[PDB]
Amino acid sequence: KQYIISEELISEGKWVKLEKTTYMDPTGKTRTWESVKRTTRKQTADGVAVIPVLQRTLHYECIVLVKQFRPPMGGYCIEFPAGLIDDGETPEAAALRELEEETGYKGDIAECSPAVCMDPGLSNCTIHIVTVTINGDDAENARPKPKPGDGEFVEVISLPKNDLLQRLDALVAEEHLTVDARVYSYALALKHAN
Amino acid sequence: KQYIISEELISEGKWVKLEKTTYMDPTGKTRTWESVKRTTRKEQTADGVAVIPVLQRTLHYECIVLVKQFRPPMGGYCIEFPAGLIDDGETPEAAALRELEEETGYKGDIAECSPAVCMDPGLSNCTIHIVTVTINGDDAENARPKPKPGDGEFVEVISLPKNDLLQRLDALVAEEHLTVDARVYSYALALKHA
Ligand SMILES: C[C@@H]1CN(C(=O)c2cnsn2)[C@@H](C)CO1
Ligand SMILES: C[C@@H]1CN(C(=O)c2cnsn2)[C@@H](C)CO1
Ligand SMILES: [Cl-]
Ligand SMILES: [Mg+2]
Ligand SMILES: [Mg+2]
Ligand SMILES: [Mg+2]
Ligand SMILES: [Mg+2]
């Protein structure tokens, strides 16, 4: 019933553009929207985010997260390891590579989502959410060696999965960070389950 | 270590702006970024709210109340938590309850309210509070709930069993062209992984 009539460029950067979208509402009245797109998609999705479950025997299972300065936020954020998918890269392979780049951990694919939207009221940005286990007793994950690309500055934070939401709250209390909304949503449902 | 040096407007629309961000990297070298921001944010602790509405009904499995809408940035239909921007002066909790009623018809009760969390921190400064709300499905007010959608809002309600959330989302995605939001997917994944 609803659909795009046309898109008008308002401004294009190197990395992102701002558009004016004309669309037909379900009454048959034409209406406008301001929409953000990345310039980089060429792919299933712009990005992957990795849910990394670090499993060591005799330890709590942890979820591995990253802390980075995010310039749009003017501050530090806690997030799932993530990055954009390279043209020709599959989302699984992007996940494995981003996890290793950002955390040094070498993981196995558990499962992969379809493309899901990041902020659909503002942007067309999508990601694949890729659940990955990390055999933390394996020698290759003993001294995880992070291989950052140029400009990445990434602290690794592993938190127990059984207390994730309280631990994220506690960090926000002392550290003055912003937790990512997908991270917080996952942490909430861990508490809300059963 | 890292901090914002300057924020230069590139293009300001009615609803969204693009900025050139200049910041200090942690090697002591100046760098830049393209940042998206809303023009709507005032003294709000966040741009918006998203509601996690748990419909509770005696001798029913608990359901998660979702909405399906056309999202002009995405050029298609998206399944999301009920959500909206916080009006000036409105509390996150008030905005969550109002948006939940407007979009679904249900009158909830506040359970919990997150700190401000980032929507897509590599791209924008947008934040929300994620507010968990219970709905007493056995109350007469929530019996045959009528949405009060605002001007240009067209929202369908989709209630899905919490105990089967992720498979139910996959079955909707299998049926038609429609995207599931990353926060909803993340929440449904965690329900599985617990
Ligand atoms: C159409 C207006 C603007 N708006 C947006 O969310 C928006 C539009 N383009 S970007 N963000 C809501 C406040 C609804 O009323
Ligand atoms: C500065 C570059 C571009 N980029 C972004 O994510 C980006 C930056 N501003 S908006 N999107 C990464 C691919 C690597 O760093
Ligand atoms: Cl798992
Ligand atoms: Mg990343
Ligand atoms: Mg990366
Ligand atoms: Mg809404
Ligand atoms: Mg609304």
Side-chain angles (χ1 to χ4, degrees), chain B residues 49 67 69 71 80-85 99 102-103 153 155:
Chain B
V49 296
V67 285
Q69 301 159 265
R71 293 297 209 177
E80 313 157 45
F81 291 127
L85 302 177
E99 291 283 349
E102 284 175 15
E103 296 186 354
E153 291 201 68
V155 192

Short mmCIF file of all heavy atoms in Angstrom, two decimals, chain B residues 49 67 69 71 80-85 99 102-103 153 155, ligand 6:
data_model
loop_
_atom_site.label_atom_id
_atom_site.label_comp_id
_atom_site.label_asym_id
_atom_site.label_seq_id
_atom_site.Cartn_x
_atom_site.Cartn_y
_atom_site.Cartn_z
N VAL B 49 12.12 7.02 22.77
CA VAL B 49 11.89 5.84 23.55
C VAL B 49 11.54 4.72 22.60
O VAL B 49 10.92 4.96 21.56
CB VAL B 49 10.79 5.91 24.64
CG1 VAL B 49 11.17 6.92 25.68
CG2 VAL B 49 9.40 6.25 24.04
N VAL B 67 5.09 -3.59 16.41
CA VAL B 67 4.34 -2.83 15.42
C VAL B 67 5.03 -2.98 14.09
O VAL B 67 6.25 -3.09 14.04
CB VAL B 67 4.24 -1.31 15.77
CG1 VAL B 67 3.24 -1.09 16.90
CG2 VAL B 67 5.63 -0.66 16.04
N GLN B 69 5.20 -1.05 10.29
CA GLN B 69 4.96 0.24 9.68
C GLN B 69 5.83 0.40 8.45
O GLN B 69 6.91 -0.17 8.32
CB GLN B 69 5.41 1.42 10.55
CG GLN B 69 4.84 1.60 11.89
CD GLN B 69 5.80 2.49 12.69
OE1 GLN B 69 6.65 2.00 13.43
NE2 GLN B 69 5.70 3.77 12.49
N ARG B 71 8.45 2.48 6.62
CA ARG B 71 9.57 3.34 7.01
C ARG B 71 10.17 3.92 5.75
O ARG B 71 10.79 3.20 4.96
CB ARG B 71 10.57 2.56 7.86
CG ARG B 71 9.92 2.18 9.19
CD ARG B 71 9.60 3.46 9.93
NE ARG B 71 9.61 3.28 11.36
CZ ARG B 71 9.43 4.24 12.26
NH1 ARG B 71 9.19 5.50 11.90
NH2 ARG B 71 9.48 3.92 13.55
N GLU B 80 8.96 -3.48 14.54
CA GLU B 80 9.76 -2.83 15.59
C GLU B 80 8.99 -2.83 16.94
O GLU B 80 7.80 -3.01 17.00
CB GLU B 80 10.10 -1.37 15.24
CG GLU B 80 10.63 -1.08 13.81
CD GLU B 80 10.36 0.39 13.45
OE1 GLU B 80 10.63 1.29 14.33
OE2 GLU B 80 9.79 0.61 12.35
N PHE B 81 9.72 -2.61 18.01
CA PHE B 81 9.12 -2.17 19.24
C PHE B 81 8.38 -0.85 18.92
O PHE B 81 8.86 -0.04 18.10
CB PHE B 81 10.16 -1.93 20.29
CG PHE B 81 10.84 -3.20 20.79
CD1 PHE B 81 12.21 -3.29 20.80
CD2 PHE B 81 10.11 -4.29 21.27
CE1 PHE B 81 12.86 -4.41 21.22
CE2 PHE B 81 10.73 -5.44 21.66
CZ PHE B 81 12.13 -5.51 21.67
N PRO B 82 7.23 -0.65 19.54
CA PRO B 82 6.60 0.65 19.62
C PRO B 82 7.58 1.75 20.09
O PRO B 82 8.34 1.57 21.05
CB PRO B 82 5.51 0.44 20.71
CG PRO B 82 5.17 -1.00 20.50
CD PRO B 82 6.50 -1.63 20.35
N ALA B 83 7.59 2.88 19.41
CA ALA B 83 8.60 3.88 19.71
C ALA B 83 8.20 5.20 19.22
O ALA B 83 7.49 5.26 18.25
CB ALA B 83 9.95 3.51 19.07
N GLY B 84 8.73 6.26 19.86
CA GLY B 84 8.56 7.61 19.35
C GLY B 84 9.50 8.54 20.04
O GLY B 84 10.08 8.23 21.07
N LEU B 85 9.59 9.74 19.49
CA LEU B 85 10.43 10.75 20.07
C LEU B 85 9.81 11.29 21.39
O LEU B 85 8.64 11.24 21.61
CB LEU B 85 10.66 11.84 19.02
CG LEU B 85 11.29 11.37 17.71
CD1 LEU B 85 11.39 12.52 16.74
CD2 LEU B 85 12.69 10.81 17.94
N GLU B 99 3.33 6.65 23.74
CA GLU B 99 3.56 6.05 22.43
C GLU B 99 2.98 4.65 22.33
O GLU B 99 2.43 4.28 21.30
CB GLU B 99 5.06 6.05 21.99
CG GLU B 99 5.65 7.43 21.67
CD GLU B 99 5.25 8.01 20.30
OE1 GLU B 99 4.67 7.26 19.49
OE2 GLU B 99 5.51 9.22 20.01
N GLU B 102 -0.78 5.21 21.87
CA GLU B 102 -1.03 5.78 20.53
C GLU B 102 -0.88 4.73 19.45
O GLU B 102 -1.71 4.63 18.54
CB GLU B 102 -0.10 6.97 20.23
CG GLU B 102 -0.46 8.28 20.91
CD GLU B 102 0.57 9.41 20.69
OE1 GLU B 102 1.42 9.31 19.80
OE2 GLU B 102 0.53 10.43 21.45
N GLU B 103 0.16 3.92 19.54
CA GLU B 103 0.46 3.01 18.44
C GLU B 103 -0.23 1.66 18.49
O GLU B 103 -0.41 1.03 17.45
CB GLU B 103 1.97 2.84 18.27
CG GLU B 103 2.66 4.15 17.88
CD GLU B 103 4.14 4.01 17.55
OE1 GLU B 103 4.70 2.92 17.73
OE2 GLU B 103 4.73 5.01 17.08
N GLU B 153 0.54 8.60 10.81
CA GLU B 153 0.98 7.37 11.45
C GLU B 153 0.01 6.30 11.02
O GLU B 153 -1.21 6.50 11.08
CB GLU B 153 0.97 7.49 12.98
CG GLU B 153 2.04 8.43 13.52
CD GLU B 153 2.34 8.16 14.97
OE1 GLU B 153 2.91 7.07 15.28
OE2 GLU B 153 2.00 9.03 15.80
N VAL B 155 -0.06 2.19 11.71
CA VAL B 155 0.61 1.19 12.50
C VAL B 155 -0.32 0.01 12.65
O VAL B 155 -1.49 0.18 12.99
CB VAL B 155 0.94 1.74 13.89
CG1 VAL B 155 1.90 0.82 14.59
CG2 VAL B 155 1.56 3.13 13.75
MG MG C 6 6.70 5.35 16.29
#
